[PDB]
Tab-separated table of C-alpha atoms and ligand atoms in Angstrom:
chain	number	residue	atom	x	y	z
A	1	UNK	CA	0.000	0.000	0.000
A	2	UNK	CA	1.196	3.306	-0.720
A	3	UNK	CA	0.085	4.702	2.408
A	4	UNK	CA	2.456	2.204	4.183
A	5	UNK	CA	5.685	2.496	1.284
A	6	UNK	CA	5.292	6.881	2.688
A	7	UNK	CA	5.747	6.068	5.711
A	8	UNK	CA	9.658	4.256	4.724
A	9	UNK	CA	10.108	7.365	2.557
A	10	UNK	CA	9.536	9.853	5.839
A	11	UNK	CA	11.261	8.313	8.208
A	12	UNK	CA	14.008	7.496	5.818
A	13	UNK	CA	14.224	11.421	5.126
A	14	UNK	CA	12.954	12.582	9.065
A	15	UNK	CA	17.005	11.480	9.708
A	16	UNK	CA	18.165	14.783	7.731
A	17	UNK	CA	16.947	18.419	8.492
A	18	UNK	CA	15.222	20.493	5.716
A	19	UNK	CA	18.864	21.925	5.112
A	20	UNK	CA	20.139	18.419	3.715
A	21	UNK	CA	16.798	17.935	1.705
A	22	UNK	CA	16.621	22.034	-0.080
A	23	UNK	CA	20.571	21.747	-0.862
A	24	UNK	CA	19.934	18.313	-2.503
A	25	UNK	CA	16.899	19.613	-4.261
A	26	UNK	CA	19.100	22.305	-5.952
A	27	UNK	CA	21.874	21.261	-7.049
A	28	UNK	CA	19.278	18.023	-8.853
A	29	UNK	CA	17.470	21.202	-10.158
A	30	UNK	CA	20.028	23.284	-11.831
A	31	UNK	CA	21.978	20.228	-13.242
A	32	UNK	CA	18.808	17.824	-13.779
A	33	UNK	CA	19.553	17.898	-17.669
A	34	UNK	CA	23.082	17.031	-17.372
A	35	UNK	CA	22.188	14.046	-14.844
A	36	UNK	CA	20.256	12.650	-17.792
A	37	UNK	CA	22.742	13.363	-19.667
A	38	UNK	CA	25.346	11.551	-17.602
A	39	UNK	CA	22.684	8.234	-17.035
A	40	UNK	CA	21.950	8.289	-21.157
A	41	UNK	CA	25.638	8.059	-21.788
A	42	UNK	CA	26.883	5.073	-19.566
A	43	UNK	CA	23.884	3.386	-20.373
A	44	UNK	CA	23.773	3.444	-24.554
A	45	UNK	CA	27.838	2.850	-24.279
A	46	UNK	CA	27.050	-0.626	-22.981
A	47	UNK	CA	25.684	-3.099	-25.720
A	48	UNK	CA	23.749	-4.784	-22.661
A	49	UNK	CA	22.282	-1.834	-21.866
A	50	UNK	CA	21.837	-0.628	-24.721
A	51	UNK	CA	19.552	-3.393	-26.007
A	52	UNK	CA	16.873	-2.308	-24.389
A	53	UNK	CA	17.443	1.436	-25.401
A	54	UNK	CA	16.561	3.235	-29.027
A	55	UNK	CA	18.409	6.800	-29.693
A	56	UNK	CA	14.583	8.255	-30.575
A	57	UNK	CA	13.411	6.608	-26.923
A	58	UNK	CA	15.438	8.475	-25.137
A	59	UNK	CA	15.865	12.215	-27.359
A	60	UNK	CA	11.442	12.132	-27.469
A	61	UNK	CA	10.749	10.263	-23.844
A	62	UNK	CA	13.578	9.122	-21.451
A	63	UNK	CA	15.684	12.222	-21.269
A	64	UNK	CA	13.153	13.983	-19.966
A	65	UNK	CA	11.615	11.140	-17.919
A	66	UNK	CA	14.437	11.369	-15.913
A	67	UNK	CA	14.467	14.723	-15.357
A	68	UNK	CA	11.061	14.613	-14.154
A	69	UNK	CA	12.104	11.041	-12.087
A	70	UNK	CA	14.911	13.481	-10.493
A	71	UNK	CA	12.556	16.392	-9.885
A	72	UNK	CA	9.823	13.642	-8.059
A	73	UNK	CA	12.244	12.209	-6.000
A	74	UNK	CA	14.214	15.724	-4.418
A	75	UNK	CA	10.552	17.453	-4.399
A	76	UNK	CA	8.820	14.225	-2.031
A	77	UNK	CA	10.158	15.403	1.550
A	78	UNK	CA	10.213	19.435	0.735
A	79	UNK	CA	6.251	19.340	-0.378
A	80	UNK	CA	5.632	16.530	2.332
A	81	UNK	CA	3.972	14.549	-1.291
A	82	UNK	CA	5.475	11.115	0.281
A	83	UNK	CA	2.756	8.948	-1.002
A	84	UNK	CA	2.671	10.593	-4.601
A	85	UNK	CA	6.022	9.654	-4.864
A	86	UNK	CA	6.360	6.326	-4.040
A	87	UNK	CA	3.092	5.468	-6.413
A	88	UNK	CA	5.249	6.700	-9.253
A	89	UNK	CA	8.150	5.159	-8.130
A	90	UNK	CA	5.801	1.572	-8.058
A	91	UNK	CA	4.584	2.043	-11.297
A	92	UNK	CA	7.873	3.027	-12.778
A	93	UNK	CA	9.064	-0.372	-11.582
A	94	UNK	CA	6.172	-2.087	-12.884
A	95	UNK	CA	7.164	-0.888	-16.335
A	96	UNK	CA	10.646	-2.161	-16.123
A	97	UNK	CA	9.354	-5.167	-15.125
A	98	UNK	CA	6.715	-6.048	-17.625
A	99	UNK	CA	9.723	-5.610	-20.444
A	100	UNK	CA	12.422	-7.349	-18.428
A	101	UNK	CA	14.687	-4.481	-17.659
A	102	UNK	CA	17.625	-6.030	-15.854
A	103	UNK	CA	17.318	-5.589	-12.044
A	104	UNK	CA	21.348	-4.833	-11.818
A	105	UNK	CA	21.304	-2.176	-14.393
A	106	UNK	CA	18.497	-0.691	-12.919
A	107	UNK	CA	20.728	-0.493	-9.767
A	108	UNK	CA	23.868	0.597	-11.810
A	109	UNK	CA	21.725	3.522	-13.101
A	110	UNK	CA	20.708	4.811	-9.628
A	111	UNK	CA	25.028	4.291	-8.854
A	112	UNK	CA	25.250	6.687	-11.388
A	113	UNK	CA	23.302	9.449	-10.258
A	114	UNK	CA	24.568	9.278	-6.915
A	115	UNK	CA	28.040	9.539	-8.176
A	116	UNK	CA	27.410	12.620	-10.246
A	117	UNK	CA	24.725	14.375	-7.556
A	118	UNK	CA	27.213	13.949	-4.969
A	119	UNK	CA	30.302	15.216	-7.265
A	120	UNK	CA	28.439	18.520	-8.089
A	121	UNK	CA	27.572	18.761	-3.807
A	122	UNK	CA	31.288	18.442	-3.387
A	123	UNK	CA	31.832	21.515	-6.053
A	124	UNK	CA	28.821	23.312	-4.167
A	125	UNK	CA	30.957	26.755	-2.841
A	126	UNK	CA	27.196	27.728	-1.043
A	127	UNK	CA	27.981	24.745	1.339
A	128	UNK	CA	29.997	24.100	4.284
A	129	UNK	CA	32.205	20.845	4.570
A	130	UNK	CA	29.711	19.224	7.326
A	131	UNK	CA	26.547	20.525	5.368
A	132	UNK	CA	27.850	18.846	1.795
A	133	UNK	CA	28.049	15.448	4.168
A	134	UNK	CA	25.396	15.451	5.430
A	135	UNK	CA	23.620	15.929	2.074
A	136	UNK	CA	25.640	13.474	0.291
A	137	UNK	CA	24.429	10.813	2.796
A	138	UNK	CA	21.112	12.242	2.249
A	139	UNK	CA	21.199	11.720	-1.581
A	140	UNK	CA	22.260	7.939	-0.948
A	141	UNK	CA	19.555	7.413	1.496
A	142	UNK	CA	16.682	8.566	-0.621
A	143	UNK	CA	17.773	7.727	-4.118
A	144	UNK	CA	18.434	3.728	-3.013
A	145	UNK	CA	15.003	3.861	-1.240
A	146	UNK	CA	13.109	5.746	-4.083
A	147	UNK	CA	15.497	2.706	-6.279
A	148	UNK	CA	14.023	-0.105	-3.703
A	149	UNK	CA	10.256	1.278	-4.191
A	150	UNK	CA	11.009	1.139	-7.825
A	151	UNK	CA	12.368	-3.022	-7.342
A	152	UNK	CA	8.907	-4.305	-5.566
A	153	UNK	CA	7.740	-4.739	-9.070
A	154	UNK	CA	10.394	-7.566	-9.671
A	155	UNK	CA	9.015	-9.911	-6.554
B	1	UNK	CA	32.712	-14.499	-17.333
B	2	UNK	CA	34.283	-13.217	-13.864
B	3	UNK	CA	37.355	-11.790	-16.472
B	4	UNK	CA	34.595	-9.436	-17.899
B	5	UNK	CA	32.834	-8.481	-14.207
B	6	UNK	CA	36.476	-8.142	-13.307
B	7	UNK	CA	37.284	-4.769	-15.497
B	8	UNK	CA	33.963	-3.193	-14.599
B	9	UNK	CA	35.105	-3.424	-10.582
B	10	UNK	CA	38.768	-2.145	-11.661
B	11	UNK	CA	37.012	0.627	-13.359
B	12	UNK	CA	34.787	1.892	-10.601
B	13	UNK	CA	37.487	1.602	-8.043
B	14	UNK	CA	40.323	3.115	-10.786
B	15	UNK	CA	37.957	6.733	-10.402
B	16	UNK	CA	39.408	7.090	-6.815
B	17	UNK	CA	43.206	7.059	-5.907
B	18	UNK	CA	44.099	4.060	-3.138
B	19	UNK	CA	44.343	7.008	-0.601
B	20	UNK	CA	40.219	6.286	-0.583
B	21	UNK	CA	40.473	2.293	-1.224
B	22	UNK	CA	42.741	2.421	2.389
B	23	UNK	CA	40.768	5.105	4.116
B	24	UNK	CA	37.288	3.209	3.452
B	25	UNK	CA	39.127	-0.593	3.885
B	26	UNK	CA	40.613	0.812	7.549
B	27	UNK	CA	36.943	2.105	8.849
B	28	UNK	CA	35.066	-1.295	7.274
B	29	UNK	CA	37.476	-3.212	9.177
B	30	UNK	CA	37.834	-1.541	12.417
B	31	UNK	CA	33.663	-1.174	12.855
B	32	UNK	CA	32.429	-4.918	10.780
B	33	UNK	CA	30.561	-6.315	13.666
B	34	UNK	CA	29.216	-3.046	14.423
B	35	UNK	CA	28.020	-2.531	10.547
B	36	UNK	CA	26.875	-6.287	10.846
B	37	UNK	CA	24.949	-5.420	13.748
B	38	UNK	CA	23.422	-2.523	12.474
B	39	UNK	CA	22.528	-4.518	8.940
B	40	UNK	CA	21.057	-7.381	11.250
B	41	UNK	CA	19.007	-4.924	13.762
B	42	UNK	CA	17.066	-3.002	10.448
B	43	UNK	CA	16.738	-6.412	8.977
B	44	UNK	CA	15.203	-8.289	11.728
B	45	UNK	CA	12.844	-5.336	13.181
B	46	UNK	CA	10.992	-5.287	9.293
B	47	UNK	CA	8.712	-8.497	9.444
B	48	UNK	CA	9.002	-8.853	5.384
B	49	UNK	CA	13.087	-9.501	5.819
B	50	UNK	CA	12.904	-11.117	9.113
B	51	UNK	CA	10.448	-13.689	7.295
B	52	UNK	CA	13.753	-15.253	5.609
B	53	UNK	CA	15.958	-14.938	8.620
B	54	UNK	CA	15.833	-16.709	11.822
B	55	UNK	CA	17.817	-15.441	15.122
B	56	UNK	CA	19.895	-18.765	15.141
B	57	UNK	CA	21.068	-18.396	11.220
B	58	UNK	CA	21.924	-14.838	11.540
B	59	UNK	CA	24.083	-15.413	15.239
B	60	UNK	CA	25.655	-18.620	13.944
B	61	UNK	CA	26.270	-17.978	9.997
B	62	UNK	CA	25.195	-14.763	8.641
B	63	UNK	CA	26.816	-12.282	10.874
B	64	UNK	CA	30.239	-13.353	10.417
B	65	UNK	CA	29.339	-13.696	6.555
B	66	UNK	CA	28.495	-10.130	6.423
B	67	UNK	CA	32.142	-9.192	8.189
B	68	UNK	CA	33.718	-11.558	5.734
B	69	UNK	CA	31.323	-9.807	2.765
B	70	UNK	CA	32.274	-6.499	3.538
B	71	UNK	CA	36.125	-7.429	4.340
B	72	UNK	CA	36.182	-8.999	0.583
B	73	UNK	CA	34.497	-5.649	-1.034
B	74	UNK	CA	37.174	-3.482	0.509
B	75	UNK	CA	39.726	-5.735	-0.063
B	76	UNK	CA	39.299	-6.007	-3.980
B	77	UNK	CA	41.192	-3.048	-5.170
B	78	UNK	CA	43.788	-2.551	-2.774
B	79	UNK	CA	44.581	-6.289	-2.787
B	80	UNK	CA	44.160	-6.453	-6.848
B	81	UNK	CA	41.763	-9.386	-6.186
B	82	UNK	CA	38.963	-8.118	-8.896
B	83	UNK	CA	38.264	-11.693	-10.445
B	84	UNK	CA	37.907	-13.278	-7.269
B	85	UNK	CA	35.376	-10.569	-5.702
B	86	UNK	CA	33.017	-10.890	-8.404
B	87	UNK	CA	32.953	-14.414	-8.542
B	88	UNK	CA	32.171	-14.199	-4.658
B	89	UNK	CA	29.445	-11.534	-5.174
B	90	UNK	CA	27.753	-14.070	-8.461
B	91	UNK	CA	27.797	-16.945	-5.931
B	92	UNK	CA	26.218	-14.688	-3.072
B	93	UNK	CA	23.513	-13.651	-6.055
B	94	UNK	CA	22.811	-17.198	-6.331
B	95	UNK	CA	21.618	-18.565	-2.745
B	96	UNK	CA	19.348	-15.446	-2.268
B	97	UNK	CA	17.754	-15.625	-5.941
B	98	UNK	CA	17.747	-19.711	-4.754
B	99	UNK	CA	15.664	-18.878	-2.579
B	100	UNK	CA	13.826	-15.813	-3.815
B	101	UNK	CA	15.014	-13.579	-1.335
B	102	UNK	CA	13.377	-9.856	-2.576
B	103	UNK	CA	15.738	-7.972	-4.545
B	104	UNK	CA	14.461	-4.435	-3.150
B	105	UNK	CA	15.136	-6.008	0.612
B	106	UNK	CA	19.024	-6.435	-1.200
B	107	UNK	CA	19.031	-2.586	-2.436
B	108	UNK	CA	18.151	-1.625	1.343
B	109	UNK	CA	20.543	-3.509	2.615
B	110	UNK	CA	23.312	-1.927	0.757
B	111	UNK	CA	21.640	1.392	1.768
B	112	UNK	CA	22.084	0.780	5.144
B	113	UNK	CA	25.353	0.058	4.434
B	114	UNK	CA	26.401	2.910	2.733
B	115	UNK	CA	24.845	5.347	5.213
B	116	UNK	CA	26.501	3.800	8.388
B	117	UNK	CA	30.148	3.475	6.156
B	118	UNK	CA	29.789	7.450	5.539
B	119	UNK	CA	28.616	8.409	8.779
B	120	UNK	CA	31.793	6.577	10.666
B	121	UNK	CA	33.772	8.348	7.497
B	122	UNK	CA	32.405	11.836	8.422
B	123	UNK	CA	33.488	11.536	12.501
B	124	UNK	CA	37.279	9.599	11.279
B	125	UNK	CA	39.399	12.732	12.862
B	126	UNK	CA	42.500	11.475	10.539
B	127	UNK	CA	40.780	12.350	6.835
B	128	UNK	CA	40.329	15.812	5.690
B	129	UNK	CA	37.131	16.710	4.614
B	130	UNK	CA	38.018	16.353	0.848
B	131	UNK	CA	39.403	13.375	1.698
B	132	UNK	CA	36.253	11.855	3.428
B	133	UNK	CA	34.000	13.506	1.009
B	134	UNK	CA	35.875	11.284	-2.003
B	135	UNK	CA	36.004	8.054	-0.033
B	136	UNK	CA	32.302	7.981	0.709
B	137	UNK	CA	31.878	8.506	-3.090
B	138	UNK	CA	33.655	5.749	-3.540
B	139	UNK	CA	32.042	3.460	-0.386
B	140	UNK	CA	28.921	4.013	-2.446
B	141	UNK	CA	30.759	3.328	-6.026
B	142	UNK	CA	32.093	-0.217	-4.684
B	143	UNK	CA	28.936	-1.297	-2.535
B	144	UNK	CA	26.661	-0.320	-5.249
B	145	UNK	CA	29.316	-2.541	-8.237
B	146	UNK	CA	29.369	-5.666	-5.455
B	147	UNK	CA	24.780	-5.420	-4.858
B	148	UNK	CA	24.730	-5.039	-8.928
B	149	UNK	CA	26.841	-8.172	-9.195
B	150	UNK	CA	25.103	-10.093	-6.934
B	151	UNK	CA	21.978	-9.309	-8.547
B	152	UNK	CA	22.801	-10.534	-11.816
B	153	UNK	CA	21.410	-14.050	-10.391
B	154	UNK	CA	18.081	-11.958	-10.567
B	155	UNK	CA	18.065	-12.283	-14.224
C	201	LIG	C1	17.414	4.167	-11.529
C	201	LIG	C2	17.283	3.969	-12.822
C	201	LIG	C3	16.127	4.292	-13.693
C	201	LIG	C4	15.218	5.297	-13.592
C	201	LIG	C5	15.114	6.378	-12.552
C	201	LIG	C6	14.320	5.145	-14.711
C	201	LIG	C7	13.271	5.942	-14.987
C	201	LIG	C8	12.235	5.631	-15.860
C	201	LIG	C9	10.948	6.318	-15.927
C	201	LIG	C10	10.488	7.481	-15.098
C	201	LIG	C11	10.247	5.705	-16.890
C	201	LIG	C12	8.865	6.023	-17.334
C	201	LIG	C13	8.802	6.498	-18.797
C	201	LIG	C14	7.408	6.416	-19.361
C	201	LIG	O1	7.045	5.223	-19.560
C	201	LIG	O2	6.582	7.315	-19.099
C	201	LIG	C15	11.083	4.628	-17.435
C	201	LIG	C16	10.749	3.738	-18.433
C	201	LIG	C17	11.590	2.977	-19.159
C	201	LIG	N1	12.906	2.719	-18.777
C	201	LIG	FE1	13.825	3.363	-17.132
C	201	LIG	N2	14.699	4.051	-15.486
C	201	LIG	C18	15.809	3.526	-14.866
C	201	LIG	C19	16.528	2.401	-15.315
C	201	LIG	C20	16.419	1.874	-16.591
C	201	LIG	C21	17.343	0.955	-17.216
C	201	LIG	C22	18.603	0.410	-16.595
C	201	LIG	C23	16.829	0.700	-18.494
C	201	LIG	C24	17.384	-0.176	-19.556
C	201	LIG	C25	18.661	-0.515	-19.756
C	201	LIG	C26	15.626	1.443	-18.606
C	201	LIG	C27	14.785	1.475	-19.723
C	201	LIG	C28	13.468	1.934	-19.752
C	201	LIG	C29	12.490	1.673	-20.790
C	201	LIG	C30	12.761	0.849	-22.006
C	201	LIG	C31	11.332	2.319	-20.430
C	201	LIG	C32	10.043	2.327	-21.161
C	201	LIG	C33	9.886	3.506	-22.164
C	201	LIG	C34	8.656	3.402	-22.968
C	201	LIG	O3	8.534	2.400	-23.724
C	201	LIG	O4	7.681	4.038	-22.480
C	201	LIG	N3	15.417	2.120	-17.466
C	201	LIG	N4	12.275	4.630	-16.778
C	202	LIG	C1	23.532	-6.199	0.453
C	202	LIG	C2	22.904	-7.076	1.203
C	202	LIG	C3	23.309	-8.463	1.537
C	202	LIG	C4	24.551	-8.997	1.674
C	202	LIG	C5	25.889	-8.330	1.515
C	202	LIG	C6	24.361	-10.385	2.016
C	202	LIG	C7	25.342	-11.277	2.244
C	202	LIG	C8	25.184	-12.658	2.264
C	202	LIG	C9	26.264	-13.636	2.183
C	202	LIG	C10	27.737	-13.366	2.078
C	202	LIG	C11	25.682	-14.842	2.229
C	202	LIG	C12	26.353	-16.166	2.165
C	202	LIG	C13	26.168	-16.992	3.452
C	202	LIG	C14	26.474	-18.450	3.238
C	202	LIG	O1	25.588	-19.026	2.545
C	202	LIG	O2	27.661	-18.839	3.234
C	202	LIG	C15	24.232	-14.633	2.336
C	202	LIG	C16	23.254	-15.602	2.396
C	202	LIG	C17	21.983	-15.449	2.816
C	202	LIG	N1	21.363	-14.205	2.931
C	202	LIG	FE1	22.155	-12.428	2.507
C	202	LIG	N2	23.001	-10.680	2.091
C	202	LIG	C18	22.352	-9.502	1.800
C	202	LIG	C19	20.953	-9.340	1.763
C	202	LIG	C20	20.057	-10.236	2.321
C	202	LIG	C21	18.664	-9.980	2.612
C	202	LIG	C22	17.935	-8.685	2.369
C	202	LIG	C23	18.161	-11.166	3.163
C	202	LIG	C24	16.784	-11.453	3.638
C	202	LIG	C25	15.880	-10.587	4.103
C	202	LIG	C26	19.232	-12.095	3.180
C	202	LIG	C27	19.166	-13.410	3.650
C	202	LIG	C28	20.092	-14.424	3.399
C	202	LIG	C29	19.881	-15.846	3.588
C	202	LIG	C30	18.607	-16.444	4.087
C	202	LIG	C31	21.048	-16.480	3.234
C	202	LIG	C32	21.312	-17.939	3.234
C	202	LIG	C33	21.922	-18.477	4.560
C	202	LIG	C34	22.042	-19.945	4.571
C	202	LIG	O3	20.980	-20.619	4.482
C	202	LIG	O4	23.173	-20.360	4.194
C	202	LIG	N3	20.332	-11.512	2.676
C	202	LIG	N4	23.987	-13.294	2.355
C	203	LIG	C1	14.746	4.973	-18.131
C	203	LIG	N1	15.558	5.640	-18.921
C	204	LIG	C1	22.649	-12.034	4.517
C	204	LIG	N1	22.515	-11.741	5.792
């Protein structure tokens, strides 16, 4: 139920302060293109990836699918819309499952943007050294959990 | 082939300098019952995991598995021992896709993982905080590359 999966979400993000969850938001806002970007490119350079990938899926849907995924997920503890969220995230993974997406590369892709989100956070001059921590945990945390919510679809 | 699995590990690991393959290998090693503990505690308290785990398996096998899991992901790199990791991590796939563990109760377990790793990484007095900041990048690179491994049993 989705009303139960919200609950995970909150308490998952309750651990961080609104300071971890706006910074996080921001720097997914202002880069959310070239996240896609990033995800697109290690994904179509590997032939098993890339299998289940067309050039025209991802220029006319994906790209910005996954700039809307990124905008869902860092927008969920902010507008307190915890059980919007993770009803996307549950039908996302029912898609992937219905067309056999591989579970590992599903988990490779969310690797991926929390390498890259957490490189920019390190680059982020507005932060302090504790604050940047504290928001790169944060961006592990909710990623893998919106990532999990996304994998009930394969059991 | 493990030869293939192999690169991808040496790849991941090859982003960061050893300074971060030592720094992350000397907190997993110094804390591995605690992190077992901690893995074993959010496992057991969720009656969905602790429906494939029994107090007896977890005190006799599991939680000195886990130590020797986590031992082996941090040895990899430093030790050169790529092949041999992710032929560890395929076999590991295999008994929980045996018997049909959930693949999104894997994903949080990494999570849980990562979070503690970076949290003991953020209070280590002897790294810098550029130097923590690029080892818990690459905790989360190399956890993330040993879960994606172990779920290729999934498909
Ligand atoms: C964490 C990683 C991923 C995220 C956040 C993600 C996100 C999404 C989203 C939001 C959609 C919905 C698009 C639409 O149907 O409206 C989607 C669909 C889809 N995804 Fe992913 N995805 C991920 C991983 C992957 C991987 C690894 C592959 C394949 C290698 C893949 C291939 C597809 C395909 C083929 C569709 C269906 C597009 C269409 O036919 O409508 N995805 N994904
Ligand atoms: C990233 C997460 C995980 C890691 C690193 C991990 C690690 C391991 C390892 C190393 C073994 C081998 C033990 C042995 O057979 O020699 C194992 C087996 C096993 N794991 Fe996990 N595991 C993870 C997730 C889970 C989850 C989520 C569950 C269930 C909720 C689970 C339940 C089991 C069970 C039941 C066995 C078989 C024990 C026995 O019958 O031999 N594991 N795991
Ligand atoms: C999904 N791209
Ligand atoms: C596996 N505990």
């Amino acid at each position: 139920s989705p009303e139960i999966l919200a609950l995970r979400w909150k308490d998952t993000c309750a651990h961080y302060s609104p300071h971890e969850w706006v910074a996080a938001r921001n720097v997914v806002t202002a880069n959310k293109a070239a996240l896609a970007d990033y995800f697109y490119e290690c994904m179509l350079a590997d032939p098993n990836a890339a299998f289940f990938l067309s050039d025209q899926l991802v220029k006319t849907k994906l790209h910005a699918s996954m700039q809307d995924w990124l905008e869902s997920v860092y927008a969920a503890a902010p507008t307190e819309e915890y059980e919007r969220t993770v009803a996307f995230q549950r039908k996302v993974g029912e898609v992937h499952a219905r067309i056999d997406i591989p579970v590992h590369l599903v988990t490779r892709g969310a690797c991926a943007l929390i390498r890259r989100i957490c490189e920019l956070l390190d680059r982020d001059a507005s932060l302090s050294a504790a604050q940047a921590a504290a928001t790169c945990r944060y961006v592990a945390d909710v990623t893998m959990t919106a990532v999990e919510m996304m994998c009930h679809a394969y059991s």
